[PDB]
Amino acid sequence: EQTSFNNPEPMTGFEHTVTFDFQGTKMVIPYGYLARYTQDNATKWLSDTPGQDAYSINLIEISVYYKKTDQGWVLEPYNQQNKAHFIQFLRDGLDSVDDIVIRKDACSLSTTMGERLLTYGVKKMPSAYPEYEAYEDKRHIPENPYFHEFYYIKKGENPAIITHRNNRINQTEEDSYSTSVGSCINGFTVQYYPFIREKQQLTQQELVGYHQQVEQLVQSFVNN
Ligand code: NA
């Protein structure tokens, strides 16, 4: 197989697509979601290669810019309005651009994760979305009064586990929350650390909202 970077810098991110193949299963991705697959300060972008039906891969790593709006947070491909955020990201990773890793594998999220959490002393709490079970870990650590973690677990056809935790361990430090998401969407595994520049505690609505956008996005790639 041969790689090509024949596409221009995007204006919207939707002007071209690239076709990928996971052992026969195709995914067609608007090229603005592929900022890591570029050359020369994001002036040459990955393109379908003549004579090759698809890029045969084991994983795809898309990159999305996340942005606050009046209607929530939204995810964007590279475009002329947000490009400076991607340029910073490509230099040192230090901007509001998240990576989402897509593979094609059988789901291995536990259908009994919540039961396990209960056995560990993590407690169930009310959920804003009935299809998610919510849990809060407030277990006591004498040396770490800041220990605090949340889980939001979805089952169904496309299960997901969202973990949101305070990374602060001392008193001079500030609160610094981070998030992990593991999920299975339409036969794919989709794993990511969203909101990478946010240190503030995020609500269930912010976290589930992001994941709903990711589910729609990944599904749009196999609608083609
Ligand atoms: Na690659």
Q: What's at 182, amino acid-wise?
A: G
Tokens coding 172: 């001079």
> From the CB of residue 84, how many other CB atoms can be counted at a distance below 10 Å?
10
Residue ranges of alpha helices (H) inside 54-159 are 83-92, 113-119
- Distance, CA 52 to ligand 1 centroid (Å)? 16
Tokens coding 54: 């698809």
Give the Cα separation of 77 and 65 in Å (integer): 6
Give the Cα separation of 62 and 87 in Å (integer): 15
What's the Cα-to-Cα distance from 57 to each of 33, 93, 108, 115, 218, rounded to whole Å?
A: 16, 23, 20, 36, 16
Tokens coding 84: 């400076």
Q: Which of 83, 53, 51, 48 is closest to 67 using CA atoms?
A: 83
Give the Cα separation of 164 and 140 in Å (integer): 17
Q: What's the resolution in A? A: 1.4
Task: State the method.
Answer: X-ray
What is the maximum alpha-carbon separation in the chain? 63
Give the Cα separation of 205 and 128 in Å (integer): 7
Tokens coding 2: 């041969």
- Distance, CA 178 to ligand 1 centroid (Å)? 26
Residue ranges of alpha helices (H) inside 99-160 are 113-119
- Distance, CA 73 to ligand 1 centroid (Å)? 28
Q: Which of 88, 8, 87 is closest to 44 using CA atoms?
A: 8
H or E, element range at 152 = strand 149-154
| Residues making up the chain, counted from first to last | 224
H or E, element range at 223 = helix 204-223
- Distance, CA 56 to ligand 1 centroid (Å)? 10
Give 104's strand partners. Answer: 188
Tokens coding 150: 């949340």
